[PDB]
Design an enzyme around this catalytic site. Sequence first.
Site, PDB file in Angstrom:
ATOM      1  N   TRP A 240       0.790  -1.221   0.000  1.00 42.61           N
ATOM      2  CA  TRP A 240       0.000   0.000   0.000  1.00 42.61           C
ATOM      3  C   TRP A 240       0.828   1.279   0.000  1.00 42.61           C
ATOM      4  CZ3 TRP A 240      -2.765  -2.933   4.347  1.00 42.61           C
ATOM      5  CH2 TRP A 240      -3.667  -3.844   3.792  1.00 42.61           C
TER       6      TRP A 240
ATOM      7  N   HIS B  58       5.173  -9.029   7.610  1.00 40.48           N
ATOM      8  CA  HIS B  58       4.199  -8.147   8.249  1.00 40.48           C
ATOM      9  C   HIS B  58       2.822  -8.804   8.217  1.00 40.48           C
ATOM     10  CE1 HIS B  58       3.677  -4.205  10.106  1.00 40.48           C
ATOM     11  NE2 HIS B  58       2.474  -4.196   9.551  1.00 40.48           N
TER      12      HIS B  58
ATOM     13  N   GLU C 130       2.911  -9.235  14.167  1.00 37.58           N
ATOM     14  CA  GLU C 130       1.937  -9.028  15.240  1.00 37.58           C
ATOM     15  C   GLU C 130       0.950 -10.179  15.304  1.00 37.58           C
ATOM     16  OE1 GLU C 130      -0.017  -5.255  15.218  1.00 37.58           O
ATOM     17  OE2 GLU C 130       1.744  -4.186  15.990  1.00 37.58           O
TER      18      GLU C 130
ATOM     19  N   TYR D  90       1.892   1.907  21.448  1.00 33.54           N
ATOM     20  CA  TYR D  90       1.276   3.108  20.892  1.00 33.54           C
ATOM     21  C   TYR D  90       0.887   3.933  22.111  1.00 33.54           C
ATOM     22  CZ  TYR D  90       1.553   1.765  16.023  1.00 33.54           C
ATOM     23  OH  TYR D  90       2.021   1.499  14.757  1.00 33.54           O
TER      24      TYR D  90
ATOM     25  N   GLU E 240       8.350  -1.708  16.166  1.00 34.05           N
ATOM     26  CA  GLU E 240       7.331  -0.758  15.748  1.00 34.05           C
ATOM     27  C   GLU E 240       6.773  -0.050  16.973  1.00 34.05           C
ATOM     28  OE1 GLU E 240       4.286  -2.269  12.906  1.00 34.05           O
ATOM     29  OE2 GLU E 240       2.933  -0.940  14.061  1.00 34.05           O
TER      30      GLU E 240
ATOM     31  N   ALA F 164      -3.404   3.353  19.481  1.00 31.11           N
ATOM     32  CA  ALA F 164      -3.068   2.117  18.789  1.00 31.11           C
ATOM     33  C   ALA F 164      -3.764   1.972  17.449  1.00 31.11           C
ATOM     34  CB  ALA F 164      -3.393   0.924  19.686  1.00 31.11           C
ATOM     35  N   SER F 165      -4.809   2.752  17.182  1.00 32.70           N
ATOM     36  CA  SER F 165      -5.445   2.706  15.874  1.00 32.70           C
ATOM     37  C   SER F 165      -4.621   3.388  14.794  1.00 32.70           C
ATOM     38  CB  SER F 165      -6.805   3.398  15.933  1.00 32.70           C
ATOM     39  OG  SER F 165      -6.647   4.796  16.117  1.00 32.70           O
TER      40      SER F 165
ATOM     41  N   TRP G 176       6.573   3.814  13.419  1.00 32.52           N
ATOM     42  CA  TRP G 176       5.566   3.631  12.379  1.00 32.52           C
ATOM     43  C   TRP G 176       4.912   4.981  12.101  1.00 32.52           C
ATOM     44  CZ3 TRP G 176       4.291  -0.677   9.623  1.00 32.52           C
ATOM     45  CH2 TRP G 176       3.044  -0.714   8.981  1.00 32.52           C
TER      46      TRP G 176
ATOM     47  N   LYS H 155      -0.400   8.504   4.323  1.00 34.04           N
ATOM     48  CA  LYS H 155      -1.812   8.390   4.653  1.00 34.04           C
ATOM     49  C   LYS H 155      -2.200   9.517   5.612  1.00 34.04           C
ATOM     50  CE  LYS H 155      -4.999   4.928   6.589  1.00 34.04           C
ATOM     51  NZ  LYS H 155      -5.154   3.536   7.079  1.00 34.04           N
TER      52      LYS H 155
ATOM     53  N   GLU I 241      -3.349  10.208   8.481  1.00 35.09           N
ATOM     54  CA  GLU I 241      -3.587   9.730   9.840  1.00 35.09           C
ATOM     55  C   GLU I 241      -2.435  10.190  10.727  1.00 35.09           C
ATOM     56  OE1 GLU I 241      -3.675   5.342   9.792  1.00 35.09           O
ATOM     57  OE2 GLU I 241      -1.510   5.175  10.009  1.00 35.09           O
TER      58      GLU I 241
END
Length: 306
Positions: A37, A100, A135, A197, A223, A229-230, A257, A262, A264
Amino acid sequence: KTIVEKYGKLSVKGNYMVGQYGDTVQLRGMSLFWSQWMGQYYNSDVVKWLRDDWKCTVVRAAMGVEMDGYLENPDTEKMKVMEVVNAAIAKGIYVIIDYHSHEAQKNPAAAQRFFSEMAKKYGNIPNIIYEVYNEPLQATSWNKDIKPYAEGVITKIRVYDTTNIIVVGTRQWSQLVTEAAANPITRQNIMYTLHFYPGTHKQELRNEAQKALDMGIALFVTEYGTCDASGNGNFSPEETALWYEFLDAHKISYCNWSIADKPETASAIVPAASPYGGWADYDLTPSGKLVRDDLRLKNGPIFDSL
């Protein structure tokens, strides 16, 4: 002299990653995003810029496995990984080859094939760090699922690459490191993944990490984010700094990360930021600025030592 010439071959001693010349080593750098992506950033210009401007001593190639990744498109996704690995070798920094996946144990033959190919090609090279299972999910048992999967992949890697570090994911999105510490893989140069996160994970997860260290294993933060965490919302600079304090106190390596555009919070760079690097201040997000500033501050003196 490059970073990899400075520290050389890496190995594990107790709670620590060490180098062949007697250094205790702590790497810090950036993760790329899912290769299927954000593959436009899987290139040598980005790797060079991450070394020269961000002062990364490691870069992570996050090869997507499910969802139109390596399982469906093996040649394309492996090519992207190899381009990043090749660039890290050319530029003298370390590189994590990250499988991944959230369900690697379901297709062990595919994973073994991939890692055998990577180890055969790159096995004699000190830059390489393998990450065999990004993960595992909350449902994915250490004793029954993760450990047997990882042992099978480790054996395949070790045919061709006898000592480079292999990092193994843990249950619940690589949080439950104490379960691995209670039943470790009793093989040379294995480390265990911790992902955090800080908008979500605070002192309770630092306590989990400390308990795993007490039990004698070595952790690698392959990471982490700066937000919840989202990947979006709850940008948490002060809590991120509490994590940096803990990681530095224990000489735990860390990669952020991510290099992705993107829109975000976790993305380090703004939408449409150049696939060739060269990102100016206006091209970085608040998260990217925070992480880049930490890299420059802490790794700058390592580069300056040469």
